Design a protein around this ligand. Structure first.
Ligand SMILES: C[S@@+](CC[C@H](N)C(=O)[O-])C[C@H]1O[C@@H](n2cnc3c(N)ncnc32)[C@H](O)[C@@H]1O
Ligand SMILES: C[S@@+](CC[C@H](N)C(=O)[O-])C[C@H]1O[C@@H](n2cnc3c(N)ncnc32)[C@H](O)[C@@H]1O
Ligand SMILES: C[S@@+](CC[C@H](N)C(=O)[O-])C[C@H]1O[C@@H](n2cnc3c(N)ncnc32)[C@H](O)[C@@H]1O
Ligand SMILES: C[S@@+](CC[C@H](N)C(=O)[O-])C[C@H]1O[C@@H](n2cnc3c(N)ncnc32)[C@H](O)[C@@H]1O
Ligand SMILES: [Cl-]
Ligand SMILES: [Cl-]
Ligand SMILES: [Cl-]
Ligand SMILES: [Cl-]
Ligand SMILES: [Mg+2]
Ligand SMILES: [Mg+2]
Lengths: 433, 410
């Protein structure tokens, strides 16, 4: 809103707060009137010779807890002068992050309540707190350092508090990423040279180098942040180049077969390749780290059609038209037979896959996906069918058959594309667990 | 052996002033530990005591120079073994586990940056590790250093007394702590829990453990999942923790590749494929939502032809009124997207808050514009697999989320 930002800090150590804000860029912001820090001496709101703000807690022992009355009066006094937003600093509160700093920025007046000893009588917290905030997943002796750290993080977002020396718009966490490294003179320090692109490169080379190192530092140190970052197309392509070739504990392959399938009467048939099975299943397989998606069809003309599609997205204009479809088709292989799939996997893994077929129908001795990680020290090949599904010969050749996907009731006639997506999600969630 | 914490900073007196207050200052006075601020400007050559300079690669951002920090750390190491921590957002997120690990050192040196940060060559040459105080940015490392020192020094035996014991605390236990109260017994009509006034020790212990588990479950459920619970703790949790679905496929307002708002055309297979997934998983109705009359006519012709439950309609508002008529109550509106949104929720969180019919919204094109995501009551966490690629078709996302919802009730 329209008022200068003001941060009131209720504390038994008000001069600790004053002293902290004499230093650094924030003290300059205070000096020229961009915000204000207002320490409130909690002992002022007492009426005994000891200026008592704490007492022995209920429940036994001699642990000390801050009393409700002084804190209540201190907050009531502020509210009597101005509207304020009341934050109790407490390990039980929201873990403070950059998103918290950006949210708290919108208030014009915030009051931070600092406890000491065991904590604060929870009645005045329930009565007066607008929220609780924790500075982190650890414990400190008092809220004072939590308060000034939050004030620092919030006040440095006030326009004009910072300037050229360090901008708040491109920074770790603010961007959803960890920042790239920084360097200054000299060009070489104890044999360690500043990256040459930063010395003699053009603007675009520098930007690309910085973006790459940021994504790399984030992937390596805080992969959890990658999952929460909405990556641009450029950032995604950098990420893929960094994860390419990383081996996981599990090597899963998917094959979509078109022979031998059943017709409506159970006779053996060869099916045509459905264009969307190429698109949809290649993207599911890539999402779940499948090592290769095999498209198996014994008819030369079907393979030629499918290979042309893949080439359009890998080497033709599709590669520019939709980069993530290219990325997914990079792992798709058009081939003629299950024997070819097995020999290809044997070449890639130096071991024969365990072959697992799929069906909507009941099969004796069918397994659940939990069995898969039991045996995932070897390559796993999941077989999916087309038409009316696999003939019985394939279900018997396979090493295992997965239990069918069911929901509620009898109807479970999913597209093969939906069945692939479900089984891969189940496998991924099982292995994480 | 007394613990020593050296802080390399351009503001040495800030460090000295901070440690005059509170229980930590008494611990310093009797020799339980010691904080030694190091003036980084003492390790400069010029008249201006220069510790920073403009960075390579453009602009006017200031970066801490490598040489002063190098000389400051080398000077310390020439006199005693020390463990060197660079304070940096890119480091290990500081937690109670971190504090307990750092406690084992007898001498730690904290390096505080200012402005854009520290020349990374001296970090590579001299850091033993990097530590971040949290997932946020502050103007300098000084407050991060003193906050870490506070957290570590208070685990030194004798620093704390009976005022507050460090053995049973939030995070140290893997849980959040129970509430605390002191005199008076009643404050503005609020009575202290009577068990704490007139209960026996076992009753007080049970109440505290239950409120702690209750608080942890409600505020930090992630902490519950990480904790190896006692048999008693797991029984308490159990006692604390002891649905019609609709699906709409929307074609406005969606992003195109450039992020502009568009209406998409119907994709024929979205009609058959998503129908079969909804029918498999007991969805009450599948709504196909498109504001263009010609697209609605196409969808109706595809459905009549495809067969030789699914409702073609014009707007989200029409879907909502339709469900309100069927269920005699408004649904909770849940949007889906591959992009993580703040406060997005899991399928497991959805099951716990679903006391009304649920409408799941699925997009087309390049997905929902942000305005839809903000209007929805909740947005689901994105589907992820290996974590570097999650561009699924809408048909596959429907299948996955419905299977997850089905399995959460099994
Ligand atoms: C030793 S703490 C008491 C913590 C409490 N016994 C617990 O375990 O949850 C004393 C005061 O320091 C502050 N404090 C300690 N850790 C904090 C954190 N992580 N976030 C915010 N404030 C904290 C609080 O204001 C608290 O009242
Ligand atoms: C259109 S379905 C044919 C359904 C046939 N009744 C069958 O054997 O599953 C084509 C392929 O999708 C997969 N599929 C479809 N529904 C499935 C389900 N409910 N459980 C497991 N796989 C399924 C199977 O791979 C099947 O070969
Ligand atoms: C404004 S920060 C520079 C941050 C850097 N530009 C970035 O975005 O990652 C200046 C100094 O404050 C300290 N600092 C800022 N945030 C920190 C954090 N989360 N953890 C530890 N130190 C931090 C660091 O010592 C840093 O060198
Ligand atoms: C083809 S996607 C649109 C583009 C998509 N937002 C992307 O970046 O990949 C069509 C719809 O499928 C759903 N969807 C696709 N991938 C998803 C994912 N990974 N997580 C959640 N929903 C997803 C969303 O409802 C989305 O609106
Ligand atoms: Cl004071
Ligand atoms: Cl074959
Ligand atoms: Cl100073
Ligand atoms: Cl989920
Ligand atoms: Mg920056
Ligand atoms: Mg405690």
């Amino acid at each position: 809103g329209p008022h200068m930002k003001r941060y009131n800090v209720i504390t038994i150590f008000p001069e600790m707060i004053n002293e902290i804000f004499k230093y650094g860029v924030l003290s300059k912001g205070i000096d020229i009137g961009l915000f204000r820090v207002n320490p409130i001496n909690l002992r002022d709101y007492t009426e005994d010779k000891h200026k008592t703000v704490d007492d022995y807690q209920y429940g036994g022992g001699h642990g000390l807890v801050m009393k409700p009355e002084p804190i209540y009066k201190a907050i009531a006094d502020l509210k009597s002068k101005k509207d304020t937003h009341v934050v109790f600093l407490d390990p039980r509160g929201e873990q403070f992050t950059q998103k918290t700093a950006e949210r708290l920025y919108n208030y014009d007046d915030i009051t931070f309540v600092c406890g000491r000893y065991e904590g604060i009588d929870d009645r005045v917290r329930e009565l007066m707190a607008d929220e609780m905030i924790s500075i982190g997943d650890f414990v400190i002796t008092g809220g004072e350092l939590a308060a000034v750290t939050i004030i620092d993080a919030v006040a440095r977002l006030i326009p004009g508090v910072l300037g050229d020396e360090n901008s708040p718009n491109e920074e770790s966490f603010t961007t959803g990423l960890l920042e790239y490294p920084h360097f200054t003179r000299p060009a070489e320090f104890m044999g360690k040279k500043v990256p040459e692109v930063l010395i003699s490169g053009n603007h675009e080379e520098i930007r690309r180098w910085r973006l790459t190192e940021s994504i790399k530092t984030t992937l390596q140190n805080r992969p959890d942040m990658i999952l929460r970052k909405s990556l641009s197309r450029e950032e995604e392509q950098i990420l893929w180049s960094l994860t390419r070739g990383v081996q996981r504990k599990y090597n899963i392959y998917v094959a979509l077969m078109h022979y031998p399938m059943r017709d409506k009467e159970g006779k053996v048939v060869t099916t045509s390749i459905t264009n969307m099975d190429l698109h949809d299943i290649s993207r599911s397989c890539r999402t779940f780290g499948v090592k290769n998606y095999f498209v198996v069809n014994p008819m030369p003309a079907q393979r030629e059609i499918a290979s042309r599609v893949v080439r359009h997205w890998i080497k033709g204009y599709g590669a520019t038209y939709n980069e993530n479809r290219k990325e997914a088709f990079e792992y798709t292989i058009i081939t003629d037979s299950l024997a070819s799939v097995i020999k290809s996997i044997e070449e890639k893994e130096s071991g024969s896959p365990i072959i697992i077929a799929t069906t909507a129908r009941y099969q004796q001795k069918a397994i659940s996906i939990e069995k898969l990680k039991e045996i995932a020290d070897r390559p796993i090949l999941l077989l999916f069918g087309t038409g009316w599904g696999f003939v019985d010969d394939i279900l018997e050749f396979a090493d295992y058959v997965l239990k069918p996907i069911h929901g509620v009731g009898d109807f479970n006639h999913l597209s093969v594309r939906s069945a692939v997506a479900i089984y891969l999600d189940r496998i991924n969630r099982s292995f994480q667990e």
